[PDB]
């Protein structure tokens, strides 16, 4: 075996020389140890993590929690973080959700950003100040056909500190829930029995995290009101799995427990004297209620306030007694609602149609200064996309409209 043997050693020598250069290069070019990331420049908030993984994973492990909706997909853009140094240039997908001016500041998506070298972060107090609490469900009555009001009892006492229009992230594990488990009043059971949504059974394959806006103004203590809309397959795609998080909430009743994982949100009013206009829809009645309650007793504001809720039928309408009292007690605030399809027994004699056109044909059409008004909206995308188009057609700048679409 001449040369068969000889080639093998000469080949290995060539390979060993090549790898040795690579390994030598690795030692002198590839960082070792652990990666230290500074959070807000505070040594206490600084996290020391070994190399590898995305930034959203490492940050969650530390005491600072970063809001995220899409997760490890780089789609929502709610996990933007300020990278003073390190992390490289902004990825092309990131630019899809971050403007160049923001890039100059240093905004980056933690999930899309892979942790590979020391990085600097400047997370704010709100992201830092996330507290996990597991409230106890008090009531789970159905407010409407597909809307449920959820009342949560604080486990630590006092009340959750949050701003009006805020939200709490609700996390649930994998769990199988059947729609039949839901308890619905006869009033709302009618659409539910016609199409028999009780047949749906949900099997959440993996733990999920979602967001739910608040329905309690800050001064309210003891109960954390919330509004939940049941998730059912799309009207155009019945061949879809049913709701996973909303269905789980609906399955709960008195005595049940759920996690809120602290507060979050960027939906708030402006501390000015400008007229306020509210455009609610479906589950949007939660944040809107907090705004109206916040501006009546929390602030005792004398500024003009208007509310325009989109509902399909009287059955769909809920929280009517509270709105009527606020309008009656204080004349600065007036609420209205229009039925897109009143029932024969409703005998509604007020506004009918969509608030997209109802609000315009009643108030904004004759308004002398529609632009000089703060607008706050939360409802179905059809309602939001149409309303903003109508508001834009009135010369309302985006800076004067705040959107909190829940889908």
């Amino acid at each position: 075996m001449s040369t068969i043997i000889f080639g093998v050693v000469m080949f290995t020598l060539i390979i060993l020389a090549l790898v040795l250069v690579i390994l030598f290069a690795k030692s002198k070019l590839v960082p070792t140890g652990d990666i230290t990331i500074s959070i807000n420049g505070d040594p206490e908030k600084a996290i020391v993590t070994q190399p590898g993984g995305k930034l959203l994973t490492a940050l969650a492990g530390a005491g600072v929690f970063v809001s995220s909706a899409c997760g490890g997909g780089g789609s929502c853009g709610q996990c933007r973080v300020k990278i003073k140094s390190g992390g490289g240039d902004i990825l092309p997908t990131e630019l899809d959700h971050i403007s160049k001016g923001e890039a100059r500041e240093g905004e980056r998506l933690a999930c899309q950003v892979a942790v590979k070298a020391d990085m600097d972060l400047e997370l704010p107090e709100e992201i830092f100040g996330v507290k996990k609490w597991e409230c106890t469900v008090i009531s789970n009555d159905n407010k409407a056909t597909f809307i449920k009001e959820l009342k949560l009892a604080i486990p630590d006492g006092e009340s959750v500190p949050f701003r009006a229009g805020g939200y709490i992230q609700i996390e649930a594990p994998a769990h199988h829930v059947k729609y039949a488990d839901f308890d619905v009043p006869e009033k709302y059971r009618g659409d539910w029995d016609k199409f028999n949504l009780f047949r749906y059974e949900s099997k959440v394959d993996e733990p999920i995290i979602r967001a739910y806006s608040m329905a309690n103004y800050p001064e309210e203590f003891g109960i954390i009101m919330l509004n939940v809309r049941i998730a059912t397959p799309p009207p155009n795609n019945p061949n879809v799995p049913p709701g996973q998080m909303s269905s789980y909430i609906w399955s709960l009743k008195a005595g049940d427990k759920c996690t809120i994982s602290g507060p979050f949100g960027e939906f708030f009013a402006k501390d000015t004297d400008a007229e306020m206009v509210f455009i609610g829809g479906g589950a949007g009645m939660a944040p809107m209620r907090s705004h109206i309650f916040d501006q009546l007793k929390r602030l005792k504001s004398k500024r003009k306030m208007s509310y325009w809720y989109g509902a399909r039928s009287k059955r769909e309408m809920f929280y009517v007694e509270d709105f009527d009292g606020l309008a009656a007690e204080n004349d600065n605030f007036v609420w209205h609602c229009a039925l897109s399809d009143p029932q024969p027994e409703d005998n509604w004699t007020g506004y009918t149609g969509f608030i997209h056109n109802v609000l315009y044909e009643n108030y904004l059409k004759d308004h002398e200064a529609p632009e000089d008004c703060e607008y706050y909206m939360c409802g179905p995308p059809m309602m939001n996309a149409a309303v903003i188009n109508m508001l834009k057609n009135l010369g309302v700048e985006e800076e004067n409209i705040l959107l909190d679409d829940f889908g």
Binding site: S2, T3, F6, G7, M10, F11, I14, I15, L18, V19, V21, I22, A25, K26, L29, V30, G88, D89, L91
Partner: protein, 197 residues
Amino acid sequence: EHYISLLVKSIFIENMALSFFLGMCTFLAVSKKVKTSFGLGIAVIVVLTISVPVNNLVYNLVLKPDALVEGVDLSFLNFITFIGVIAALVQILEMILDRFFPPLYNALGIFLPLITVNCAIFGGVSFMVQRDYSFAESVVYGFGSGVGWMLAIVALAGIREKMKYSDVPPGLRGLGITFITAGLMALGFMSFSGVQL
């Protein structure tokens, strides 16, 4: 001297991209920005200028027939040895781009590992073993081939940047038109066809 002529052969006359059509996969892929294309071209020159002379010494000192011992020719260890050497440098190249990573580690992505296994790099070693180039000629040839390759890639990036005003049909947009552009580029490089040495 003679070297300037060798450098001219490996840049224009033997342009590895537009004349020999070597390395088209990476050449037709990262060619969309002059800055990124220039970065790859610089890296390719670095890989080529180092790969070829090193393999020339290994070939003439180890793999050359009747070189290590009389009567033993380790010619059969030519492709495996060369590609491995090329692969090593690419692996190190990946590391250096970790310092200049914004422009190229992200853009090259899947192709950064592919610097090796590029028809241009392996082929240059082959010509250095098919032909008989001294070590000095190997360095001049390797640098020249890379520069000629860099000239083509940077030029295709310039053309594509100019295409910001072009209205390419969808379907041809990106790779399809790039192939047509490269065919047209090769058409104009056929000016050197009769040139000999």
